[PDB]
Amino acid sequence: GSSHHHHHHSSGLVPRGSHMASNPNDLPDFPEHEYAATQQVGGGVINGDLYLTSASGAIQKGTNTKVALEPATSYMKAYYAKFGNLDAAKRDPDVQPPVLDPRRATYVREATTDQNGRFDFDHIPNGTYYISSELTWSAQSDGKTITEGGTVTKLVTVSGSQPQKVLLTR
């Protein structure tokens, strides 16, 4: 069996790589160097209560929901502006996102809210962070099923070395 064929899977030039020290993220206009800038053993005790209030006044906290506390870098200047807070009513599954920085996966501290819908942190440096949480609920209003919520990312600056009570509802 000679088999005159092409690539069984097109992977371009080479999977997992870059140009020449230059990263291929190409998302932010400004240098995203700030990933390796946010370093400091801190004592910022964060006490966050997670709940987005519906227009009805109904409080949806966030059951089995992952609260990701990640640093607000120059990289996220472009990312947050594109998506950031996007309602599920416009949750497009066709628009492809760019290659996100893998270093974020190291900095992303996840607080999965069990049932109480509240999370706490300890030993965190000061600065400006994004709390990313995809919380959405689809309920019926009058008769038609609407889908409220979506990707809620909250801009939270941590300047409190003492128990910092924070509410994520917007």
Q: How many CA atoms lie within 13 A of 16 on its CB side?
A: 1
Q: How many domains does the chain have?
A: 1
Question: What are the tokens at 141?
Answer: 């209003």
Technique behind the model: NMR
Q: Which residue has the tokens 């190291």?
A: 106
How far out from the chain centre does Cα 50 lie?
15
**Structural domain that includes position 59:** 1-170
Cβ(140)–Cβ(110) under 8 Å? no
Q: Which two tokens stand for residue 45?
A: 């005790």
Distance (Å, whole) CA 54 – CA 60: 7
Give residues with Cβ within 8 angstroms of 167, minimum separation 6. 48, 49, 51
Q: H or E segment at 105?
A: helix 104-107
